[PDB]
RNA sequence: AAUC
RNA sequence: UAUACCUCUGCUUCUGC
RNA sequence: AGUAGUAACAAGAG
């Protein structure tokens, strides 16, 4: 969706400083720590074995209700479903060379945005955040 | 490394010389004794409790008294007879 | 000691389940016999309530034949099993799960039950545990001097209420009979350290694994920890 | 496929030893579906956990209406043997 | 060749016989300093301690903090942590087996010699069983 | 106007 | 011995941090 | 033979 709806600009050849900095690789639905996301996942797929509830049980109640209603009719294995949640909840942060764009929806396209001797203008689709602006 | 280079570069005295030794060690594994590694842990755990000091001290104590097994052995042959046979590690000295 | 008293009075079902509960909390049964006794009583109080009560197919309580008790014992079982059962009930019956671990659950009432053991007053212990639970579990407090403070809609019937109070004081009388009541009343708490010490063989390996000019590991430990090498 | 060289060798005995564990672990996962995702915790016995899990699964399914009197009494008879 | 070379760099140190194993042991630490450019294993303890002392001065409060960090990790670390060690040497059968199996063979063999540290779930008791298993006079194990 |  | 012009096998006695 | 190169393969096993 972020590639199809997107639009491209001008290629431009010329030197580019690219700085090495930790960045989010893929944009998440709602960011959480490893335990919090896991506890949320547990509530979505395996409610009986979840164990002791935490505060996080209450905090994301809307997300759990949404995801349990969304992932209701599917026949696909739980272990797969839990993997796909983990991607759209737990954060993938690693070091990359960047210049101009830090946002995850750009970081995923980084390879086509900038090289050591060139620049490419890119406009991703969907919606963009207000704080990011 | 890139940031640590810039600092240790521009730190040098003006009107002086800064030289980079492109370095590498030899026999790295064969020279470092386990008893040094034992003495290292003790000084690192100085403040930590006596059980943990003893816990950390075991792995270097093992490596200090380790025994190395000698692979498969040695295959001996006769080209005239066209025969082969592995002499195993215990039978290394069961033959002239 | 209390160790001998629990062997004679209590069953092996209660002896093991208590010790297993102390193992999960990382506490030693032998170092704290009085602390085991609390859970030994607390677990036996729960069993006495459940042992007689059963439900029939129509959905009404009776006294015992059918393979479905009116109560469900949560205390005694391991944490991960108990919390599975606690959730399994609340999710099926359609109620919000308690934040703390409950002791019993009544199938006809569809409510959790929390049991407490107290030496002094029952009403004092009742309103103390009301602050934690609020109105999550229906409290059933009992004490050794025949003083009890139950919940507003208490499921504990008058027939069992006697049997509960019978064993309570009958135990307390048997404790003071061999001067065992003095140990429970006195203070008992020991600080749980991390258990790791070396054996005979490994120590001897550590003694030979020493630098040149050292008698043993004691000599190496002192050297590193004391002397200054500078220069 | 698995490397079948093990069939000719004396380590055949591990093949059954594996499939014995695999039978237990696959049954454990049928009782506990979160065993695939989450690492299960417990110093208690592996059978004990499975028994208690299946005990409530029966009792609740009867009371809810998912299990009949015919099937519940069969289930309660089996768990008694174990 | 590695065994020869390793002992070639230490042979001028202290040679002794281990009373535990009955093996030939060599010790170069706190030995005579080299008079050549050949690989010296004769590392002097005091110099290593002084090098560490300087590092403790240049990086203060690090040693005890890192010693805490690792200790607090140890408590949380389970027995299963050993399963991710690729091919490991199984002492029962004297073959390099999968770490998951090599562990399971070692846990089951320990149980026969009255060593159930793994059953507690923590690594610390399993490590306590390993140091105690040296003391057991006859170590029983399975063979099919 | 950065953390994790 | 014989079955065996058969049968099984192709990283599964070595491949780590 | 050859492949290879500090030691192997050029089938092994029941």
DSSP letters spanning C111-152:
EEEEEEEESS-HHHHHHHHHHHHTTSEEEEEEETTS--EE-T
C191, C196, C203, C213: best mutation site toward chain B, by most B Cβ within 10 Å? Answer: C196
Resolution in A: 3.8
| SS3 at position C62 | strand
DSSP letter (8 states) at residue C69: B
CA-to-CA dists, residue B75 to B23, B84, C205, E3, angstroms: 40, 7, 36, 20
Q: How far apart are CA D47 and CA A67, in angstroms?
A: 33
Considering the domain boundaries, does residue C5 fall inside one?
Answer: yes
Do E122 and C24 touch, CB atoms closer than 8 A? no
- Distances, alpha carbon E38 to alpha carbons A116, C120, C169, E11, in Å: 46, 81, 85, 13
Contact E118, E125 (CB under 8 A): yes
Question: Cα separation of E73 and E61, whole Å?
Answer: 18
Kind and range of the H or E element at E107?
helix E99-112
Nucleotides of H under 7 A from a protein CB: 7-9, 12-13
Q: Exposed e or buried b for every residue in B55-75, given b needs 16+ CB within 10 A? A: bbbbebbeebbeeeeeeeeee
Instruction: Please provide the size of chain A in residues.
Output: 133
CB E62 within 8 A of CB E54: no
Token couple for C212: 């040149």
Alpha carbon of D43: minimum distance to chain E alpha carbons (Å): 6
The C-alpha angle E84, B63, C215, rounded to 5 degrees, equals 145
Strand partners, C114: C139
Residues of chain D in contact with residue E117, where contact means CB-CB under 8 angstroms, are: none
Domain span at C52:
1-192
Chain E closest-CA separation from residue C30 CA (Å) = 17
Please tell me the distance from the alpha carbon of residue A123 to that of residue A101, in angstroms, as a whole number. Answer: 11
- The SS3 assignment for A96 reads strand
> Domain range spanning residue D55?
1-82
Closest nucleotide to A31's CA, by C1' atom? F4
Cα(A38)–Cα(A89) distance, rounded to whole angstroms? 9
On whether residue C213 sits in a domain, the answer given is no
Contact criterion met (CB < 8 Å) for A38 and D38: yes
Q: Is residue C214 part of a domain?
A: no
In chain C, the number of structural domains is 1
**B65 labeled binding residue:** no
Which segments of B29-91 are extended strands (E)? 73-78, 83-88
Q: Residues with Cβ < 8 Å from C142, sequence gap 6 or more?
A: C45, C115, C116, C117, C118, C122, C148, C164, C165, C168
Q: Do residues A49 and A82 make contact, with C-beta atoms less than 8 angstroms apart?
A: no
Query: Does C203 map to a domain?
Result: no
Half-sphere exposure of A15 (CA within 13 A, CB side): 1
Give dist(CA E126, CA C176) in Å, integer: 42
Q: Quick check: helix, strand or coil at residue E110?
A: helix
Q: How many helices (H) and strands (E) does chain D have?
A: 4, 0
C103 marked ligand binding residue: yes
Inter-residue contact D9 to D2 (CB < 8 Å): no
Report d(CA A105, CA B76) in Å as an integer: 65
* Burial of C132: CB neighbours in 10 Å, binned 0-12, 13-18, 19+: exposed
| Number of separate domains in chain D | 1
Name the 3-class secondary structure at D82. coil
Q: Where are the alpha helices (DSSP H) in C67-226?
A: 79-93, 122-133, 158-177, 181-185, 200-208, 217-226
**Cα gap E27→C67, rounded to integer Å:** 73
């Amino acid at each position: 969706m972020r590639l199809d709806n997107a639009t491209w600009g001008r290629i431009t050849f010329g030197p580019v400083e690219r700085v090495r900095k930790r960045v989010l690789l893929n944009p998440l639905t709602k960011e959480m720590p490893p335990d919090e996301a896991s506890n949320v996942i547990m509530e979505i797929l395996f409610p009986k074995e979840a164990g002791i509830p935490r505060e996080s049980t209450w905090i994301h109640r809307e997300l759990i209700k949404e995801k349990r209603e969304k992932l209701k009719g599917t026949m696909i294995t739980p272990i797969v479903l839990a993997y796909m949640l983990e991607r759209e909840l737990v954060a993938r942060r690693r070091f990359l060379p960047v210049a101009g764009a830090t946002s995850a929806e750009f970081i995923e396209m980084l390879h086509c945005l900038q090289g050591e001797n060139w620049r490419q203008i890119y406009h991703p689709g969907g919606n963009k955040l207000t704080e990011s602006r | 490394l890139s940031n640590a280079v810039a600092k240790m570069l521009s730190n040098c005295p003006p009107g002086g010389i800064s030289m980079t030794v492109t370095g590498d060690n030899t026999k790295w594994n064969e020279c470092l004794n386990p008893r040094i590694f034992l003495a290292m842990t003790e000084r690192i755990t100085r403040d930590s409790p006596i059980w943990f000091r003893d816990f950390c001290s075991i792995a270097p104590v093992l490596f200090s008294n380790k025994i190395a097994r000698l692979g498969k052995g040695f295959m001996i042959t006769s080209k005239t007879k066209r025969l082969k046979a592995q002499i195993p590690c215990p039978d290394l000295f069961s033959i002239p | 000691s209390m160790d001998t008293f629990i062997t004679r009075n209590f069953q092996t079902t209660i002896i093991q389940k208590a010790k297993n509960t102390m193992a999960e909390f990382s506490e030693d049964p032998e170092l704290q016999p009085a602390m085991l006794f609390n859970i030994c009583v607390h677990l036996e109080v729960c069993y006495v309530i459940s042992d007689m009560n059963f439900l029939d197919e129509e959905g009404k309580a009776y006294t015992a034949q059918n393979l479905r008790p009116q109560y469900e014992v949560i205390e005694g079982m391991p944490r991960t099993i108990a919390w599975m059962v606690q959730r399994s009930l609340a999710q099926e019956h359609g109620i919000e799960t308690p934040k703390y671990l409950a002791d019993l659950f009544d199938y006809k009432t569809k409510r959790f039950i929390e049991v407490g053991i107290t030496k002094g007053l029952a009403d004092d212990y009742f309103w103390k545990k009301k602050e934690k639970l609020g109105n999550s579990m229906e409290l059933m407090i009992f004490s050794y001097n025949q003083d009890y403070s139950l919940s507003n809609e208490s499921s504990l019937d008058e027939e069992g209420k006697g049997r509960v109070l019978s064993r309570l004081t009958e135990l307390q009388a048997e404790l003071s009979l061999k001067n065992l009541w003095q140990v429970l009343i006195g203070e008992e708490d020991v600080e749980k350290g991390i258990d790791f010490k070396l054996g005979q063989t490994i120590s001897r390996l550590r003694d030979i694994s020493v630098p040149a000019g050292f008698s043993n590991f004691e000599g190496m430990r002192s050297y590193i920890d004391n002397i200054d090498p500078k220069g | 496929k698995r490397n079948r060289s093990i069939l000719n060798t004396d380590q055949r005995n591990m093949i059954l030893e594996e499939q014995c564990y695999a039978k237990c672990c696959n049954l454990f996962e049928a009782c506990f579906n979160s065993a695939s995702y989450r690492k299960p915790v417990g110093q208690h016995s592996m059978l004990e956990a499975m028994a208690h899990r299946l005990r409530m699964d029966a009792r609740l399914d009867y009371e809810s209406g998912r299990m009949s009197k015919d099937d519940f009494e069969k289930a309660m008879a089996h768990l008694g043997e174990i | 060749d590695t065994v020869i070379r390793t002992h070639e760099y230490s042979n001028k140190g202290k040679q002794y016989i281990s009373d535990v194993t009955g093996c030939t042991m060599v010790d170069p630490t706190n030995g005579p300093l080299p008079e050549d450019n050949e690989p010296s294993a004769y590392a002097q303890l005091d110099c290593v301690l002084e090098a560490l002392d300087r590092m403790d001065e240049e990086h203060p409060g690090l040693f005890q903090a890192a010693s805490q960090n690792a200790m607090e990790t140890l408590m949380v670390t389970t027995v299963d942590k050993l399963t991710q060690g690729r091919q490991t040497f199984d002492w029962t059968v004297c073959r390099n087996q999968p770490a998951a199996t090599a562990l399971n063979t070692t846990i089951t063999s320990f149980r026969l010699n009255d060593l159930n540290g793994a059953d507690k779930g923590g690594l610390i008791p399993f490590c306590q069983d390993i140091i105690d298993s040296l003391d057991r006079p006859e170590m029983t194990f399975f063979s099919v």
